[PDB]
Paper text:
[name] has 68 amino acids inserted into the [name] polypeptide chain between [name] residues 915 and 916. [name] and [name] are held in their closed auto-inhibited conformers by an extensive nanomolar affinity interface between their N-terminal four-helix bundle Vh1 subdomains and their respective Vt or MVt tail domains.
The initial processing of a single ab initio three-dimensional reconstruction, including all particles accounting for best two-dimensional classes, and subsequent homogeneous refinement yielded a 4.17 Å resolution structure that overall resembled our earlier crystal structures confirming overall the auto-inhibited conformation of [name]. The local resolution estimate suggested that the central core is well ordered to 4.2 to 4.5 Å and contributes toward the overall resolution of the [name] structure. While this interface is restricting the remaining domains roughly in their places, our cryogenic electron microscopy structure shows that they are surprisingly mobile. This suggests that this region is flexible and in various conformations. The coiled coil (residues 949–960) preceding the α-helix H1’ could not be built in our cryogenic electron microscopy structures with residue 840 through 960 missing. Out of the three modes computed by three-dimensional variability analyses, one mode provided a glimpse of discrete conformational states presented by [name] in solution.
Author numbering: 1 to 837, 960 to 1116
């Protein structure tokens, strides 16, 4: 396959394929029009010269570079290119004899593919080696990690504190080489953002090591908690290093990410169901304890996370978790109806207090059914990706060995077993296709039964066809999960609109199940948004949530009775589509009300934990205060993480901002135990001088983590939305200042004056971060200036608070406080005041009209990015028939190779054109990250469409590899035009910002 693993490989193949394109448009009169050609016999030797240079180094790389497996695979590679090139000249030599010789036109069309596959192989095959030594570098590091528990003593500390140096500095220089070598934002970003984690936390690993000798100064057998905290980061060192091992091994377009990035969600979920197990079910079992806000909230946290389990599995099980959870919702409100009146809850729910419980416990077992199957479904994809390589191993160099046949037939016994474990009852057409191919693969395995004496002359034709048989397996085993795993929720919210706007009125991806998960996805968050409010404000959102819930199944049926053209089917679709638009501004405005109420006192228990970190047992209650401060820490943090990830998945952010949140909240998910772990050991070995800075380390980790996140959640939501949900929020809190002055409450003003300064400091912090991202000097000055007005008045509120706490029954004095309070909030309001101003492949024809709905968001004709998007998706419509068919006109397919890249290099330009006029860093940076994959994938379509041109109309065309050709055609145009959707949107989204 014509890979694009390296910047160099693109920089050569497009020079390779530029004239093989021009070679085979001569083949258009060569066999389609069937007539004589002009003498392009010199471009023959030119592209020979364009490959012989890498051949003449590739020939000697077999011998000069002393690696073993390069000697194995290269003589398959370039000799095929040599077998191609020798046929090219003789095609022209037979065309020197004859103006148009029927074999000679077929000899040249024979070689025109084998170069392009071969050159893409040759440029890959030793770039495969360039990655390979970096593995053993990392394997050197990963096993020098393994040294660092064999090493636990100080006499090897400063040695290996130095020995990391020529490893770790030698790590990053190879990576920062390779960081320039890839050409995907999806790859370049996830490489280095795992590479900084190992270099940042190796001093933290050293910080564990430097404090372990301090514990080793204390007596043994109570000190391995540090080595377990070492093992904490070392398993993270096991984690983030292993990630970038296999990132560089990917060497193509990304496919197995989503099957892998859903493994994390269930173990996020199933732990969270285990963690929210006890406190949820108690309110279910206590009628007369809480009226529906404390453990009732954790009840719905169980259900809306198990609802996120059911966003993964397939079939009718996509309904049976939805059907179990939604019917559990009303019956809790049937329980909530009882204690709203009171008499029904304790005596009368002798039956009712168990039908709710049985719809949780078997629901726990029902989502447990989706647990181990979906681990094992993504699993053994990699095993059958590995047992083919074990089959690829010996079948390259057989040497006529009949006991190498015996181990290559024993290795296929495991390669047998996987597809029966990969069997599903759904794709019965493909299952008999799969299971029928397996015994056929044992029959070409049974070719080796006749070789009592092994035959490489049999094996050279055996490996000629078992290699095409294994890629007939792997391109079908990955389908055996792809048509069995439903289409995922686009994690940013505007995708879940788009994954469900067009979904409801079309049978196409009704076979796929995009919106059926996505609508189940989208109101599993407004369902969780309504979880955090009290009694009466739980229902007003749930009434909009239950609106879609009863708009759910009554559009699951109208695919039978008519379609979207049917009148009340369209009306129920129109009732559903109108239901979601007023489920926007009561979802994200529901969100931003929460974030200005969770992140207020953003770190106040931690300075209280710092009080708990310093107080000896000479100070009173060094344990139970230290418990409840940590209990205040651990449970406010549960709000802190969960408020962020909701504001992640609802807030309009970059993908890099969303995963930037998603990793940082994951960083919060274990550092919050580490803050507990840091405050622990300082109180285990009491009052160490060397443990305070380690506590101060993880604190100023977590403070830097949270004051990243505090700033980074502010990257997600609107700053119009934060202030308005803060100015009104501080307004009642200055009205809370009015209630505690009417009675004699000094400390409630002392708790309140902080509560201003908990937030009024942060309002200044958001204003400065707005300025440094702003560049209009008239429209960044007041955000600096009024923040400094806020700076002018934050400190006198602390001072007169001490003046009025000493005398609470002093009108005038407490009046002067609230009058000093009166000066605050109008200036706080100023912050948002500045913010006021036929043989057709289907995924071709779908992706054309898919792009058109996105560019029709803007409704004018001025800037030609919509004319760029016009020519974009329209000029794939002609090649809809030309993939899978249209055997003659190969020339239009390459005419489509160029014009699409010509469009997706034009909109490359205009994306970064207005980015040069983009008046915000964060808007330009997010525009820059996506726009570098506009030209990269464009030129790849110059290759791949030209590759299928040789795969077109020969009539010796294998419809496995023509399918492999047309898969890479259509998989491109998805990833092509989905990036173009992000382009023509965010160009307009940056257009108003000027």
């Amino acid at each position: 396959m014509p890979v694009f693993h390296t910047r160099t490989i693109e920089s050569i193949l497009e020079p390779v394929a530029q004239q093989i394109s021009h070679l085979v448009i001569m083949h258009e009169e060569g066999e389609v029009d069937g007539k004589a050609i002009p003498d392009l016999t010199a471009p023959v030797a030119a592209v020979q010269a364009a490959v012989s240079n890498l051949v003449r180094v590739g020939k000697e790389t077999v011998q000069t570079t002393e690696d073993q497996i390069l000697k194995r695979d290269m003589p398959p590679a370039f000799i095929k290119v040599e077998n191609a090139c020798t046929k090219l000249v003789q095609a022209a030599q037979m065309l020197q004899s004859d103006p148009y010789s029927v074999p000679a036109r077929d000899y040249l069309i024979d070689g025109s593919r084998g170069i392009l596959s071969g050159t893409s192989d040759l440029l890959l095959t030793f770039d495969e080696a360039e990655v390979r030594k970096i593995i053993r570098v990392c394997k050197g590091i990963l096993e020098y990690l393994t040294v660092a528990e064999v090493v636990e003593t100080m006499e090897d500390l400063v040695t290996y504190t130095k020995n990391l140096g020529p490893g770790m500095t030698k790590m990053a220089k190879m990576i920062d080489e390779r960081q320039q070598e890839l050409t995907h934002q999806e790859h370049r970003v996830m490489l280095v953002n795992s590479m900084n984690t190992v270099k940042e936390l190796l001093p933290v690993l050293i910080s564990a090591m430097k404090i372990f000798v301090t514990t080793k100064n204390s007596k043994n057998q109570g000190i391995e908690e540090a080595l377990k905290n070492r093992n904490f980061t070392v398993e993270k060192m096991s984690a983030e290093i292993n990630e970038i091992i296999r990132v560089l091994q990917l060497t193509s377009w990304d496919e197995d990410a989503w099957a892998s990035k859903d493994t994390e969600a269930m173990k996020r979920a199933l732990a969270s169901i285990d963690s929210k197990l006890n406190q949820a079910k108690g309110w279910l079992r206590d009628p007369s304890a809480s009226p529906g806000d404390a453990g009732e909230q954790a009840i719905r946290q169980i259900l809306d996370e198990a609802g996120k389990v059911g966003e993964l599995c397939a079939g009718k099980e996509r309904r049976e978790i939805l059907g179990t959870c939604k019917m559990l919702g009303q019956m809790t409100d049937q329980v909530a109806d009882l204690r709203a009146r009171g008499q029904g809850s304790s005596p009368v729910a002798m039956q009712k207090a168990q039908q709710v419980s049985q719809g949780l416990d078997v629901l726990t077992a029902k989502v447990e059914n989706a647990a181990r199957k979906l681990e094992a479904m993504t699993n053994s994809k990699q095993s059958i990706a590995k047992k083919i390589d074990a089959a690829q191993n010996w079948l390259a160099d057989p040497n006529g060995g009949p006991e190498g046949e015996e181990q290559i037939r024993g290795a296929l016994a495991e390669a047998r077993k996987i597809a029966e474990l990969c069997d599903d009852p759904k794709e019965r057409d493909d299952i008999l296709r799969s299971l029928g191919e397996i015994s056929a693969l044992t029959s070409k395995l049974a070719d080796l039964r006749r070789q009592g004496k092994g035959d490489s002359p049999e094996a050279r034709a055996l490996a000629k066809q078992v290699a095409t048989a294994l890629q007939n397996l792997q391109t079908k085993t990955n389908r055996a999960v792809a048509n069995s795993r439903p289409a995922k929720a686009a994690v940013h919210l505007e995708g879940k609109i788009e994954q469900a706007q067009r979904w409801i009125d079309n049978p196409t991806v009704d076979d796929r199940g995009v919106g059926q998960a996505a609508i189940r996805g989208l109101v599993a968050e407004g369902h969780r948004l309504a979880n955090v409010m009290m009694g009466p404000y739980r229902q007003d959102l749930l009434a909009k949530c239950d609106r879609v819930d009863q708009l759910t199944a009554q559009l699951a049926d109208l695919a039978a009775r008519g379609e979207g053209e049917s009148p009340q089917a369209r009306a129920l679709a129109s009732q559903l589509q109108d239901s979601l638009k007023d489920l926007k501004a009561r979802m994200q405005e529901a969100m931003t009300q929460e974030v200005s109420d969770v992140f207020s006192d953003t770190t106040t228990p931690i300075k209280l934990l710092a009080v708990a970190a310093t107080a000896p047992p000479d100070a009173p209650n060094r344990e139970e205060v230290f418990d409840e401060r940590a209990a205040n820490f651990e449970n406010h943090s549960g709000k802190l993480g969960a408020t962020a990830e909701k504001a992640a998945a609802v807030g309009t952010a970059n993908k890099s901002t969303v995963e930037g949140i998603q990793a940082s909240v994951k960083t919060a998910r274990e550092l919050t135990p580490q803050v507990v772990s840091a405050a622990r050991i300082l109180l285990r070995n009491p009052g160490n001088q060397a443990a305070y800075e380690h506590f101060e380390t993880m604190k100023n980790q977590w403070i830097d983590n949270v004051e990243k996140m505090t700033g980074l959640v502010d990257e997600a939501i609107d700053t119009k939305s934060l202030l308005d949900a803060s100015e009104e929020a501080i307004k009642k809190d200055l009205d809370k200042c009015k209630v505690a002055m009417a009675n004699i409450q000094p400390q409630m003003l002392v708790a309140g004056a902080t509560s201003i300064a908990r937030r009024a400091n942060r309002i200044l912090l958001v204003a400065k971060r707005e300025v440094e991202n702003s560049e209009d000097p008239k429209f960044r000055e007041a955000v600096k200036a009024a923040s400094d007005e806020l700076s002018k008045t934050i400190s006198p509120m602390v001072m007169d608070a001490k003046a009025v706490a000493g005398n609470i029954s002093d009108p005038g004095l407490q009046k002067s406080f609230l009058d000093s309070g009166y000066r605050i909030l109008g200036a706080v309001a100023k912050v948002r005041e500045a913010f006021q101003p036929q043989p057709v492949n289907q995924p071709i024809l779908a992706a054309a009209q898919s792009l058109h709905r996105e560019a029709t968001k803007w409704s004018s004709k001025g800037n030609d990015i919509i004319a760029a998007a016009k020519r974009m998706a329209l000029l794939m419509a002609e090649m809809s028939r030309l993939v899978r068919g249209g055997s003659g006109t190969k020339r239009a397919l390459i005419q489509c190779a160029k014009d699409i890249a010509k469009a997706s290099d034009e909109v490359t330009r205009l994306a970064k054109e207005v980015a040069k006029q983009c008046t915000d860093k964060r808007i330009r940076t997010n525009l820059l990250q996506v726009c570098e994959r506009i030209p990269t994938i464009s030129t790849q379509l110059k290759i791949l469409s030209t590759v299928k041109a040789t795969m077109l109309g020969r009539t010796n065309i294998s419809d496995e590899e023509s399918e492999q050709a047309t898969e890479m055609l259509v998989h491109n145009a998805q990833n092509l035009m989905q990036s173009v959707k992000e382009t023509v949107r965010e160009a307009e989204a940056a257009s108003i910002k000027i």
